[model samples]
Target: GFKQDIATIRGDLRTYAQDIFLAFLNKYPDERRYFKNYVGKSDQELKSMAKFGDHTEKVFNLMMEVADRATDCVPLASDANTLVQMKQHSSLTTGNFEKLFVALVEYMRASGQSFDSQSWDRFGKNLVSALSSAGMK
Candidate 1:
């Protein structure tokens, strides 16, 4: 019943989100600049937004979609090693998770959404908490 209900593969998330996000932009071109602007902000600001849960998921997911489409960060949730491999294979760096993650936050801002630092910090910590709780799954 969640957003990823039917996706059985990691690649599926990228494909599905891309398809939907593109459709969203196409259906709302006036909003395209919004997303672009948000995604283009400083990693600090993006990090703040992503830390906040307000619109982080949407923005992050969209940014990942765009990054995956434009660059090469194949979105996946399997394991850190696998994720690292994907990044390396794509000519990306392992230390880029935070930067790349912030891209998604910026995309949300570009979409004209307001974000706050506290919220971002909270969300960031929460994400860490979740990962820790799950022991990296």
Candidate 2:
């Protein structure tokens, strides 16, 4: 139950990131220029920017930073689990666990695996059905 909600919130980070980008540029006009120049490119074009402008290089470097910060944040699983448990069994608070969970998901998604959401859904549904059949309802 907890992981499901956390995972859903985590999945929204891309939308949140877009919102943040909009708000950031709403405050800093120059930032919009950068995105406007490189926002929508074919994968090959984005990947080939190393031959010209440093667009892809910069994006890759930023992803490296994201990966590094994610590594430093690995231990926060305890805090996340705690927050989820508290929300599940205790009281509620306006804590931003979604941001942490999203970052963690993004990190793992980028690490080295081909994340298969459809497969995960099928497995999860099977487990849920099995549990219900076992009187876990």
Candidate 3:
């Protein structure tokens, strides 16, 4: 069995959005600058913030865009568009990018989602390629 298409995990986008960011923040405390408005807020308060929810969906789109497509071309331009949309919002090192993805993967696993080592390997490459192709790294 394989888990390649990240699109499948977005069925509960709202809930996932809040929890994933919480996980990311908990793991990488400094990355919170990008979400300053959400700082110190309760989970329910964060979920109630329309802009935060909108931002999470945008991030989810990036996740879907950069998912492991295996033989398919990596579609660098699509990722570029997503980054440009958020470029002004914040900047990050490749490590920061990886940390966020790590949080996301960890949260999903803790919630009963399964991902193989190969899945994580591809996820790493996906983030690298997305950043590199977007001219961020």
Candidate 4:
């Protein structure tokens, strides 16, 4: 059931969130400009900041919600809308959004999480599709 799956993965979601963020920075160094607030901080140092912790926690919680309603387009669409709005204040692009998912999959593997890769890939595809639908792409 969805409840059981979420419960099982919940334990590692925080770490996964952090890993995704850090991995994004490491893999695309220039993209660090998106996090201008973390200026003067190295990639390693950025992980320890309050901003990092707060965003990581928020992302994990958001993903938990996503897991709960994976098949519901409403929640995903809402999130897509939020991301669209975020673009107004940030440098986020379709390419950056794609990279985020790639980073997420890489993080899961590196952390040895037993998440379903196919499901994750489907979610990533759906997310990008939704983003394009929302006019971000």
TM-score of each: 0.27, 0.25, 0.74, 0.78
67-123 in candidate 1: lDDT tens per residue?
333212222233333433442234433223333334434443454324343333333
The lDDT values for all models are: 0.38, 0.36, 0.65, 0.69
Q: State each candidate's clash count.
A: 13, 0, 0, 0
What lDDT would candidate 4 get against the real structure? 0.69
Off by over 4 Å in 3: 1-5, 68-86, 115-121
**Whole-model lDDT, model 2:** 0.36
Q: lDDT of model 2 at residue 29?
A: 48
Give the per-residue lDDT digits (tens) of candidate 2, residues 47-126.
44543234333333433233233322232333334333432324322222222224334443443434443433333343
Better of 2 and 3 by TM-score: 3
Tell me which residue pairs clash in candidate 4.
Answer: none
Give the local distance difference test score of model 1.
0.38
The better candidate by TM-score, 1 or 4, is 4
**Model 2 misplaced stretches (Cα beyond 4 Å):** 1-9, 37-137
What are the per-residue Cα lDDT tens digits for candidate 3 across 1-137?
A: 23433545566666766788788988888878667787887767777889888988877655655553433434356654466457463566567777877887677677766645356545566756766666664
Task: Write the residue-wise lDDT of candidate 4 on 1-137 in tens digits.
Answer: 43554675577666656767788778877777777776567767766787887877787787778757767323378877776777443556678777876877776566654656555656777877877788874
Worst window of 10 by summed lDDT in candidate 3: 66-75
Candidate order by TM-score, highest to lowest? 4, 3, 1, 2
